[PDB]
Design a protein around this nucleic acid. Structure first.
Length: 322
RNA sequence: GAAUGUAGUAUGCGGUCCUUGCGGCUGAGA
């Protein structure tokens, strides 16, 4: 069940840097899955790692047709060209290839679920991508408030009038449909709504077998991070543990190639102990893992949960071919 | 996660300079 959350006003999600009296400038980051997970936990508690699992969260735009927007993959150049890693046996090294030069800049933006059903194959259309400005803007409120120095700057997320945030929740765990809850930093709220699972999901769910068998026959698999994941075993590391892919039935891995941005540093407030939660590092959303697996994948779903805190919404990954 | 105040679009500036109410007409006809 999707959870549409249309913001009445702008939203600010606190970055880890403190802001009480000294660091008056308070920037914003993209909504971490923990914040939305806590908001949904409050919502279900009012209606009646949590016992229920949140698959993840994606942006959406409602202009006649209702479509969910997924973070732009790191596998797409700014010229809408895919990047594929091919290995050079002569030099013994593997490089990422865009067929137009060894250097490229990832395309910042989004990718609709129609894009997802076509991007997993290995091609991307033009209409499948949306720029960042079409969804949200960085609205910075200034001079909000012996108070001569209390004037502090705040940057918020100014979503477009037809754009909001949708949270993906597994079937069941039903609760209140229409209502309002607070999300973010400085006290703001959204007008959330409960909507049946979109036809895009079933479009990608039904066509999962084709991509799955293509991956199985070609011996190549790509894993796309829809939401950030904490893949460390003891600490926090970006290296993909080979046992992690052993759950889906990978007998052996030949080579693993991963491209991603700077890690996201975050923490939380432990309401039970009234102390901040341990700091964590997660691989940024939109990163893709290129693996050369031996064997086959027996996963019945086109997605899997990787890492810890997967119930919140972390580690939403899609299996794709390259 | 919670947690303005003070402030005159004012200061100075001449609707002035150059232009003939002129031109033509019998207080006359028997």
């Amino acid at each position: 069940m999707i959870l549409v959350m249309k913001p009445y006003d702008s939203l600010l999600f606190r970055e880890p840097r403190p802001f009480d009296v000294n660091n008056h400038v308070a920037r914003t980051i993209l909504p971490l899955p923990q914040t939305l997970a806590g908001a949904v936990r409050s919502a279900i508690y009012v209606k009646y790692e949590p016992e229920f699992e949140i698959l993840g969260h994606f942006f959406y735009r409602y202009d006649g047709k209702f479509e969910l927007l997924v973070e732009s993959p790191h596998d797409v150049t700014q010229n809408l060209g895919l990047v594929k890693p091919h290995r050079i046996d002569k030099l013994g090294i593997t490089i990422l290839m865009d067929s137009e030069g060894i250097k490229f800049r990832p395309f910042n933006g989004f990718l609709k679920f129609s894009g997802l059903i076509d991007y997993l194959q290995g091609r991307i259309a033009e209409d499948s991508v949306v720029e960042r400005q079409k969804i949200f803007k960085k609205e910075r409120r200034v001079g909000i408030a012996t108070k001569e120095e209390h004037f502090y700057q705040v940057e918020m997320l100014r979503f477009s009038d037809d754009c909001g945030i949708a949270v993906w929740v597994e079937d069941g765990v039903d609760f209140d449909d229409e209502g309002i809850l607070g999300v973010g930093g400085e006290r703001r709220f959204v007008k959330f709504e409960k909507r049946e699972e979109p036809e895009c999901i079933t479009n990608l769910r039904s066509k999962w077998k084709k991509i799955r068998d293509k991956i199985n026959e070609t011996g190549r698999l790509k894993i796309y991070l829809a939401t950030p994941a904490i893949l460390g075993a003891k600490g926090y590391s970006s290296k993909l543990d080979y046992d992690l892919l052993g759950d889906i039935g990978i007998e052996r891995v030949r080579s693993v190639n991963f491209i991603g941005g700077k890690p996201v540093i975050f923490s939380g407030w432990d309401f039970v102990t009234r102390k901040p939660k341990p700091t964590r590092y997660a691989v940024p959303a939109g990163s893709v893992y290129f693996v050369e697996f031996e064997g086959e994948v027996k996963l019945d779903m086109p997605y899997l949960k990787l890492g810890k805190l997967t119930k919140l919404g972390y580690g939403l990954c899609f299996m794709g071919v390259w």
